[PDB]
Ligand binder design. Structure first.
Ligand SMILES: CCCCCCCCCCCCCCCCCC(=O)OC[C@H](CO[C@@H]1O[C@H](CO[C@H]2O[C@H](CO)[C@H](O)[C@H](O)[C@H]2O)[C@H](O)[C@H](O)[C@H]1O)OC(=O)CCCCCCCCCCCCCCCCC
Ligand code: CLA
Ligand code: CLA
Ligand code: CLA
Ligand SMILES: C=Cc1c(C)c2cc3nc(c4c5[nH]c(cc6nc(cc1[nH]2)C(C)=C6CC)c(C)c5C(=O)[C@@H]4C(=O)OC)[C@@H](CCC(=O)OC/C=C(\C)CCC[C@H](C)CCC[C@H](C)CCCC(C)C)[C@@H]3C
Ligand SMILES: CC(C)=CCC/C(C)=C\CC/C(C)=C\CC/C(C)=C\CC/C(C)=C\CC/C(C)=C\CC/C(C)=C\CC/C(C)=C\CC/C(C)=C\CC1=CC(=O)C(C)=C(C)C1=O
Ligand SMILES: CCCCCCCCCCCCCCCCCC(=O)OC[C@H](CO[C@@H]1O[C@H](CO)[C@H](O)[C@H](O)[C@H]1O)OC(=O)CCCCCCCCCCCCCCCCC
Ligand SMILES: CCCCCCCCCCCCCCCCCC(=O)OC[C@H](CO[C@@H]1O[C@H](CO)[C@H](O)[C@H](O)[C@H]1O)OC(=O)CCCCCCCCCCCCCCCCC
Ligand SMILES: CCCCCCCCCCCCCCCCCC(=O)OC[C@H](CO[C@@H]1O[C@H](CO)[C@H](O)[C@H](O)[C@H]1O)OC(=O)CCCCCCCCCCCCCCCCC
Ligand SMILES: CCCCCCCCCCCCCCCC(=O)OC[C@H](CO[C@H]1O[C@H](CS(=O)(=O)O)[C@@H](O)[C@H](O)[C@H]1O)OC(=O)CCCCCCCCCCCCCCC
Ligand code: OEC
Ligand SMILES: [Ca+2]
Ligand SMILES: [Cl-]
Ligand SMILES: [Fe+2]
Lengths: 243, 97, 102, 137, 176, 153, 51, 335, 51, 51
């Protein structure tokens, strides 16, 4: 174990815990004993942004991006119950935790793509009949992606949703129909997809690890422009305990 | 068409009475004995399909249910508005003195 | 706010950054707001809440001690802000509290 | 335009009975208010909890009623939450916690009454200012 | 009462953004530089006309030779700054020109403020800021400061208007 | 119409800017018609009045008061605790004489729109297309003559 | 609704103040028609000065 | 070769150079060149910077929609605070430009160079056999750059609160400063304008008096400046005639007759005045602000009788209340 | 559908003909991403000449 | 698409004018997409061809 001072500034704090190459066993499920996740953690490795195919529909792919912010990406301290289902499957239901981190990435052009990387209200599920959690025991489910900026946020000219100006006060006698979209703030709310695939188990201490892949939309800036589709790949760590 | 959900909400029951599904917690201070204990329970306990559903909060003492019945006339209920509920704004919407 | 039933860990501020808790540039869990610049602060009252990765959400959730709350309140209300004529507070404050931090 | 004893007449208890303070008490209260309150309650607000002010109306809708000498005085000894369903003397200055809040050790019952009187007299003088914050400065 | 006159012109006229004012400060600030630099230059290029350290007594009130080395002063600034005077007659006229010209430019700006013909905004900037909610400059920031100044000051600064601004109509940021 | 046109702040020489070049029409646009006098009322039927803009102010808030000057309605900045929002007060607007003569509007956006306009005095219909106006007030020849001759002098 | 002082006219008003209020093309400042300004029209005035 | 290093030292120290590269110059010249080059490129082509660390990038370069007046180099992020942020501390330059990397590189290099520039103003004076202290006069404008670029950020705990490198950006720094500190009501500031006003005043005073009492050596249709030759023995103006006039404007003993006492005063006043104004910013960097006379004078009942100080406070609140919109989450601005 | 020669590019092609086909900002003439042009990008070349 | 784009007269350098300044995009505009090959036919079903 390492103290706080043994981590500070090293960037290690933005790293989900890891298992050794040994720990590749299996953790058993009583199915008559409630289980929960004491700590889920998600660490991003890559941020992919699906590019707009221009007018020419030609099918679009995801493109790598540079992380313009710094090591503030990781999600940690996630918790909730891991209820066992009738069909012998497992479904995780998140309760609370650092379930979101605002990330901003750049592209080829130089365009900054801000997103709210999150897993709020996660409901991941596994395969039916899973007496023991083995290596690669896929977790899949949805989560909620709330607006990047919240109600109180004001744009550089003072306009906002829950507060702020009603219009473009700098152009007192201008036609307003054109400015409509920029004056009227909208609060976006959408769904997301994620799949946590195990790679390392440890039946002894009951802690699994592996990699994840999630998809969601980026910031629409209070509904001023269209959001970008984002793909996020990384690693995760879960601490399973009876409780 | 584009509309400001918060300003539109002010044309409903919200903006006239304490909305049990949206209105921020600090609003319960304007009525006797509602704020600390009870308002927490109200807000924490999900939305409600009707004003009366607040009396069904599990754990409520006989006195708490009495107080609630008294202030029911000051309550209403509308669709949960994300703009007003997201970000924990019901516990702190960034407003102070 | 936590006593009012707010989940500080997942609370989203106006900028979408973290009303109460956020991350330092190297990943450590720190206090949110303009106070992000003072994430280098260490102090007896605050340390028992700190973990190996910074502020622990579990200790924050149920290990907060009363002496810490009123300590925070004390130091909060005695910031080194004042006027030449010794009027504690921001330049826009009203006369009442005669104080300027030593 | 002066501090008449007409202004210094504030409600003593819940049963309508009133008390008339003196210019000595007021000043004394005002001084003691700076000594032990101003720190968090400057100009009738509450820095560490802006949701609750020292407005007489706010004190009236308190539980128990704290919009009188008696209400306030009890509070300064055994402070509670706005609904009164919880004692907060551990994180709030009071007589039963003078070991924790040294400023309250000196304070004697006269001092308590003076302070209480001050809280009830200020809004009579300042008005909206006493309650509101920077808006009314 | 003069300080508010400053804050007023900022809030209402955006006086700092006025080209005529900028020339103003340039003259005053530049004039206060000439004052400093020339005085210091002279005192530290002086000839020795006495045997004491306090060289003040060692000055001849009845003209004759130059009390300080103009030639040395020249080569100095020519090597540290690259440019240097070499005509006391021009140097001193320059000391007249700079602060007098500045004050005059600042005057013209004020004459325009009388008709409220201010240098408040940049149209190209506002048009983009309206269409684009992510466009932000230090210019845009300042105007928001002005809005706050106008709203919060006007009531007690212009009593004759009987202003009444509800708390809810007062422009405010978050928390503050 | 002419008489009404004078009661519009967009013809006030004290409005404008030093580098806001061109005619006044590059500002609010070429005036086409008088939309008409706007009368504001609330649910109780009480007639409200829009507080006009002082020349000093580049921007001014929308506030409605009755005859006695009591604030009855407004357009809030922070909605969180608004007491006088047009929605809460059921503010409506009616027009008499002119383009909008005899018509009434009750939908909050539209009502707030004209209320936002009444700040400037009598509401008019402008042609912004032609000269490609920017919606920013410019001073009259009266303003410019005064400025030049005051400086020159 | 669209008079000279709305169209940024600076010299035009000074010509109208002292009599010249018509054009050779037929129109007039007051807004009348069929009027005959004679030679001393806005065009006429402009012409003279050039000469 | 008499000795390479010995020659090198003689060249550096040489007073026969067009520009005196001193020993301080060895540090100055490179540092000033990095500062300027980085500045020029940034001001033109740098991308928007998240100054307040709230993921709200502020564009301040020409190519990104600014002009000279609005354009600026944006201070480093508030997420960085007082941390040292060189290029080799970023995963990429894209990241470096986003967190306001250039700003530190500039201010540090400038302040370093501008200090050596003061050091050189001594050296050359030493090499030429003239008295020092010219550099002491330059310590006042330098101490201001230090206060505005370094001392205040240190005090406030972040370089994001340092004065931006731009026109309008400079205006923001002032307006906000006034709000948080009430600088107009601070003695040290008042001494500053006194020095600056008096400076411009005395600059015009001395300038005019001298140029008005010039000995005639020029034609009626010939520049009066030509009546002076570079490297004169005697004076070009009648200082006794100058004193005679100014001595009658006010009264004799309130007039200078000693050119040396004159030029000392000409130098002392603004330098001293600016010194205090620099100390003002450095003092209010630790939140020892100007006089607070809010709600001072009250009537016999207790009603608050307003002064101009209160009218100032209203203006200040508006600045306070509106600045850094989305940066605050809590009631008190202790940052 | 929108290459350099449609955008009135005159100097850019001559830099692409001899190797320089990338930018410090990440993009490239061929349309690839993640590439590392090194120093000798369009910016680099432009930089060099100015010096 | 790229191959089809070359078979468009709006990329022929022999089209244009001496004072028709700017890029090719100031002309026909920025190419967005290939509408597709147009096949012309008449009532009898015969396929026609555009000169
Ligand atoms: C012409 C006129 C020229 C005038 C020039 C004036 C120069 C003044 C600069 C002072 C020298 C600084 C040396 C020093 O005291 O150095 C120390 C200071 C202060 O450092 C601070 O040190 C602090 C130490 O923590 C302490 O405080 C923490 C909370 O504050 C905790 O309490 C913790 O327990 C406790 O140890 C923190 O680390 C702060 O983040 C950190 O800024 O350095 C600083 O920032 C200085 C910033 C670096 C620039 C210095 C270059 C010098 C060449
Ligand atoms: C870098 C900072 C800076 C600087 C250097 C300046 C510089 C200037 N400003 Mg300024 N300003 C600034 C920032 C700055 N500004 C900011 C940030 C604001 C806020 C928006 C303003 C707002 C502002 C306003 C509102 C005005 C100025 C004006 C001026 C100019 C005139 C000052 C002067 O000489 O008064 C001297 C004034 C006189 C009237 C001189 C006559 C005085 C008599 C002769 C003295 C008699 C004394 C008597 C004998 C003694 C008795 C007194 C007794 C107490 C003993 C000057 C060019 C003024 C201007 O442009 O005027 C044209 C003006 O009105 N400024
Ligand atoms: C002083 C007399 C005067 C006045 C009051 C006007 C008034 C007007 N003119 Mg006009 N004009 C004049 C003389 C005048 N004119 C002259 C002499 C010419 C011939 C060149 C013109 C040519 C002209 C044209 C071609 C047009 C107008 C238009 C207009 C109208 C729009 C106003 C405008 O754009 O202002 C703009 C004012 C400014 C931009 C102010 C400039 C101030 C400068 C920048 C200050 C310079 C400071 C200096 C450099 C400092 C250095 C000193 C330092 C070294 C000490 C307005 C009615 C327009 C019109 O008809 O409207 C429909 C129009 O299109 N004018
Ligand atoms: C000869 C070399 C050359 C060539 C082939 C090009 C080619 C191009 N340039 Mg370019 N340019 C060049 C040199 C060159 N440039 C130089 C040296 C500069 C610096 C000033 C520029 C600055 C420049 C800019 C700023 C822009 C271009 C643009 C363009 C593109 C548009 C073409 C255009 O507008 O043509 C227009 C051609 C003409 C109008 C022909 C003018 C012929 C004159 C009028 C003849 C003069 C005759 C003379 C007066 C007779 C007197 C003699 C008599 C007394 C005997 C095109 C790819 C544009 C671009 O990037 O596209 C998107 C653009 O915006 N160029
Ligand atoms: C605010 C700054 C400032 C002040 C206070 C100031 C003051 C003075 N400058 C004078 C001179 C000058 N000033 C000059 C250039 C400059 N002066 C500048 C800035 C200033 N100069 C600047 C920036 C320049 C460069 C352009 C020159 C070139 C001269 C002189 O020749 C002259 C002098 O002799 O220098 C020593 C003196 C004129 C005496 C006089 O007329 O009394 C007689 C008239 C009186 C007493 C009536 C004045 C009444 C005034 C208009 C109203 C004041 C109202 C209250 C009484 C004052 C208090 C109000 C304040 C609190 C705001 C006086 C001491
Ligand atoms: C007569 C009668 C009827 C009697 C009634 C008298 C009466 C009621 C009078 C009332 C007048 C009144 C109310 C006040 C007038 C205002 C007044 C006192 C003016 C202010 C003057 C003052 C005290 C300031 C002096 C400032 C001062 C220190 C001078 C600066 C000197 C300076 C740096 C100049 C540069 C300089 C100086 C030289 O000296 C020479 C030589 C040269 C070269 C040179 O550069
Ligand atoms: C380290 C070196 C740093 C480089 C310093 C660069 C100096 C700038 C030189 C300016 C040109 C000087 C000149 O024209 O006159 C050079 C002359 C020197 O020549 C003079 O000629 C006069 C006429 O005969 C008299 O004879 C004088 O005696 C004689 O010396 O200087 C002066 O007289 C005027 C002094 C004021 C100089 C201006 C200050 C420079 C401020 C620059 C601000 C602009 C910044 C813009 C940023 C974008
Ligand atoms: C030092 C003392 C300085 C004092 C200055 C006092 C000036 C007094 C103000 C007089 C205002 C009259 C301005 C007349 C010009 C005018 O109106 O044009 C105003 C023009 C035209 O205005 C245009 O009007 C059009 C409709 O007709 C459109 O509406 C456009 O929107 C509008 O811009 O606008 C400008 O671009 C202003 C820029 C002025 C910059 C001056 C450059 C100087 C060039 C010198 C050339 C020398 C050649 C020899
Ligand atoms: C005698 C012999 C003469 C032989 C001449 C041979 C010339 C060879 C032709 C070379 C073409 C390259 C032209 C480069 C310029 C250019 O492209 O600009 C072309 C510019 C810019 O072009 C613009 O491009 C924009 C997109 O970027 C927009 O699309 C605009 O639509 C478009 O006009 O257009 C012009 O205005 C052309 C006018 C040129 C007139 C020349 C005036 C000369 C001024 C002299 C100044 C001297 C200063 C010292
Ligand atoms: C990372 C490390 C980088 C290393 C850089 C590579 C080495 C430096 C190469 C320099 C090449 C450029 C030569 C410049 C010539 C010149 O300056 O004058 C040429 C003169 C002539 O002397 C000189 O010239 C004489 C030869 S000759 O006369 O020029 O032929 C010579 O004999 C004598 O020794 C010499 O003094 O040189 C000098 O006077 C010495 C001072 C030079 C000052 C350097 C610039 C100062 C900048 C200050 C900061 C400014 C901030 C930004 C300003 C916008
Ligand atoms: Mn840029 Ca000085 Mn107002 Mn805390 Mn932030
Ligand atoms: Ca895109
Ligand atoms: Cl700001
Ligand atoms: Fe001199």
């Amino acid at each position: 174990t390492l103290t706080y001072d043994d981590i500070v500034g090293t960037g290690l704090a933005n790293k989900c815990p890891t298992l050794d190459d040994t720990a590749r066993g299996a953790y058993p499920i009583d199915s008559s004993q409630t289980y929960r996740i004491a700590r889920l953690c998600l660490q991003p490795t890559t941020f992919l942004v699906k590019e707009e195919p221009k007018n020419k529909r030609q099918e679009a792919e995801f493109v790598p991006t540079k992380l313009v912010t710094r090591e503030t990406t990781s999600l940690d301290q996630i918790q909730g119950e891991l209820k066992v289902n009738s069909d012998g499957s497992l479904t995780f239901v998140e309760e609370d935790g650092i379930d979101f981190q605002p990330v901003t990435v750049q592209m080829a052009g130089g365009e900054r793509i801000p997103l709210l990387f999150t897993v709020k209200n996660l409901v991941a599920s596994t395969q039916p009949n899973v007496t023991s959690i083995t290596t690669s025991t896929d977790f899949k489910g949805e989560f909620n992606v709330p607006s990047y900026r919240t109600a109180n946020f004001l744009d550089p000219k003072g306009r906002g949703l829950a507060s702020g100006y009603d219009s473009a006060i700098a152009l007192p006698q201008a036609k307003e129909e054109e400015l409509a979209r920029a004056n009227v703030k909208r609060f976006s709310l959408t769904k997301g997809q994620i799949s946590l695939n195990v790679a390392k188990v440890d039946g002894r201490t009951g802690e699994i690890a592996g990699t994840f892949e999630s998809e969601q939309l980026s910031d629409d800036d209070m509904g001023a422009h269209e959001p970008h589709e984002v793909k996020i790949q990384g690693v995760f760590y879960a601490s399973i305990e009876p409780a | 068409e584009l509309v400001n959900v918060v300003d539109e909400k002010l044309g409903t029951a919200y903006g006239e009475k304490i909305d049990l599904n949206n209105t921020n917690i600090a609003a319960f201070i304007q009525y006797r004995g509602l704020y600390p204990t009870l308002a927490k329970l109200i807000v924490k306990n999900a939305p409600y399909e009707s004003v009366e559903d607040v009396l069904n909060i599990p754990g409520l003492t006989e006195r708490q249910k009495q107080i609630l019945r008294e202030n029911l006339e000051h309550f209403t209920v509308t669709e949960v508005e994300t703009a007003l509920v997201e970000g924990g704004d019901r516990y702190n919407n960034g407003l102070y003195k | 706010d936590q006593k009012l039933g707010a989940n500080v860990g997942s609370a989203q501020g106006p900028t979408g950054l973290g009303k109460y808790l956020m991350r330092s540039p190297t990943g450590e869990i720190i206090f949110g707001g303009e106070t992000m610049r003072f994430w280098d602060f260490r102090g007896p009252w605050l340390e028992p809440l700190r973990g190996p990765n910074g502020l622990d959400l579990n200790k924050i959730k149920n290990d907060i001690q009363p002496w810490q709350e009123r300590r925070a309140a004390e130091y909060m209300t005695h910031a080194p802000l004042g006027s030449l004529n010794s009027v504690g507070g921001v330049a826009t404050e009203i006369n009442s509290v005669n104080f300027v931090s030593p | 335009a002066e501090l008449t004893p007409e202004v210094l007449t504030v409600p003593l208890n819940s049963e309508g009975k009133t008390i008339t303070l003196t210019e000595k008490q007021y000043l004394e209260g005002k001084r003691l208010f700076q000594y032990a309150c101003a720190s968090c309650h400057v100009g009738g607000i509450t820095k560490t909890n802006p949701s609750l002010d020292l407005r007489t109306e706010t004190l009236a809708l308190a539980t128990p009623p704290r919009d009188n000498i008696e209400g306030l005085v009890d509070y300064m000894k055994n402070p509670t939450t706005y609904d009164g369903e919880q004692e907060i003397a551990e994180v709030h200055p009071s007589l039963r916690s003078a070991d924790i809040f040294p400023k309250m050790r000196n304070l004697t019952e006269k001092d308590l009454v003076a302070i209480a009187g001050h809280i009830l007299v200020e809004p009579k003088i300042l008005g909206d200012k006493w309650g509101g914050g920077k808006v009314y400065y | 009462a003069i300080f508010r006159f400053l804050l007023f012109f900022q809030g209402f006229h955006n006086w700092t953004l006025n080209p005529f004012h900028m020339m103003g400060v340039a003259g005053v600030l530049g004039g206060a530089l000439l004052c400093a630099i020339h005085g210091a230059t002279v005192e530290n290029t002086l000839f020795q006309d006495g045997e004491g350290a306090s060289t003040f007594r060692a000055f001849n009130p009845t003209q004759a030779e130059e009390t300080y080395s103009m030639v040395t002063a020249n080569r100095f600034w020519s090597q540290i700054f690259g440019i240097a005077f070499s005509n006391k007659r021009w140097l001193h006229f320059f000391m007249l020109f700079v602060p007098v010209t500045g004050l005059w430019m600042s005057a013209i700006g004020v004459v325009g403020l009388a008709l409220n013909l201010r240098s408040y905004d940049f149209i190209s900037q506002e048009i983009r800021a309206a269409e684009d909610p992510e466009f932000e400059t230090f210019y845009t920031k300042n105007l928001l400061l002005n809005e706050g100044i106008r709203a919060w000051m006007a009531p007690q600064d212009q009593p004759h208007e009987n202003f009444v601004f509800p708390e809810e109509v007062l422009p405010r940021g978050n928390a503050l | 119409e002419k008489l009404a046109f004078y009661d519009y702040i967009g013809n006030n020489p004290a409005k404008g800017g030093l580098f806001r070049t061109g005619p006044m029409n590059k500002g609010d646009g070429i005036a086409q018609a008088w939309k008409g006098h706007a009368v504001f009322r609330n649910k109780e039927g009480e007639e409200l009045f829009v507080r006009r803009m002082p020349a000093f102010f580049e921007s001014f808030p929308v506030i409605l008061t009755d005859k006695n000057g009591v604030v009855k309605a407004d357009i809030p900045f922070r909605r969180a605790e608004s007491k006088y929002s047009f929605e809460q007060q059921g503010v409506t607007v009616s027009f008499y004489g002119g383009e909008l003569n005899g018509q009434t509007f009750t939908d909050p956006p539209t009502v707030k729109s004209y209320a936002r306009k009444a700040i400037f005095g009598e509401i008019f219909e402008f042609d912004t297309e032609t000269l490609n106006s920017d919606g920013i007030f410019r001073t009259s020849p009266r303003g410019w003559f005064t400025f030049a001759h005051a400086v020159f002098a | 609704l669209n008079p000279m002082w709305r169209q940024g006219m600076f010299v035009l008003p000074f010509m109208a103040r002292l009599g010249v209020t018509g054009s050779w093309s037929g129109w007039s400042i007051t807004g009348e028609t069929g009027i005959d300004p004679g030679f001393w029209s806005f065009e006429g005035v402009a012409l003279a000065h050039i000469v | 070769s008499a000795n390479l290093w010995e020659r090198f030292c003689n060249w550096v120290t040489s007073t026969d150079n067009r520009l005196y590269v001193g020993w301080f110059g060895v540090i100055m010249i490179p540092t000033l060149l990095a500062a300027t080059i980085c500045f020029v490129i940034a001001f033109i082509a740098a991308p928007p910077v998240d100054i307040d660390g709230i993921r709200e990038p502020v564009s301040g370069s020409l190519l990104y929609g600014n002009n000279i007046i609005t354009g600026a180099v944006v201070p480093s992020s508030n997420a960085i605070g007082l941390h040292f942020y060189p290029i080799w501390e970023a995963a990429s330059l894209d990241e470096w430009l986003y967190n306001g990397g250039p700003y530190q590189l500039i201010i540090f290099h400038f302040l370093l160079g501008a200090s050596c520039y003061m050091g050189r103003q001594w050296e050359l004076s030493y090499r030429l056999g003239m008295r020092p202290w010219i550099c002491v006069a330059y310590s006042a404008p330098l101490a201001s750059a230090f206060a505005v670029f370094l001392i205040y950020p240190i005090g406030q705990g972040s370089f994001s609160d340092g004065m931006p490198l731009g026109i309008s950006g400079t205006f923001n720094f002032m307006i906000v400063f006034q709000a948080e500190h009430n600088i107009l009501m601070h003695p040290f500031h008042q001494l500053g304008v006194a020095g600056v006003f008096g400076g411009a005043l005395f600059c015009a005073m001395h300038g005019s008096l001298v140029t008005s009492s010039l000995i005639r050596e020029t034609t009626e249709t010939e520049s009066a400046n030509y009546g002076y030759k570079f490297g004169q023995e005697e004076e070009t103006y009648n200082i006794v005639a100058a004193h005679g006039y100014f001595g009658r404007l006010i009264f004799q003993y309130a007039s200078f007759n000693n050119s040396r006492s004159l030029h000392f005063f000409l130098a002392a006043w603004p330098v001293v005045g600016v010194w205090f104004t620099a100390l003002g910013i450095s003092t209010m960097a630790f939140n020892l602000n100007g006089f607070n006379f809010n709600h001072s004078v009250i009537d016999a009942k207790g009603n608050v009788i307003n002064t101009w100080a209160d009218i100032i406070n209203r203006a200040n609140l508006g600045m306070e209340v509106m600045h850094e919109r989305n940066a605050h989450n809590f009631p008190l601005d202790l940052a």
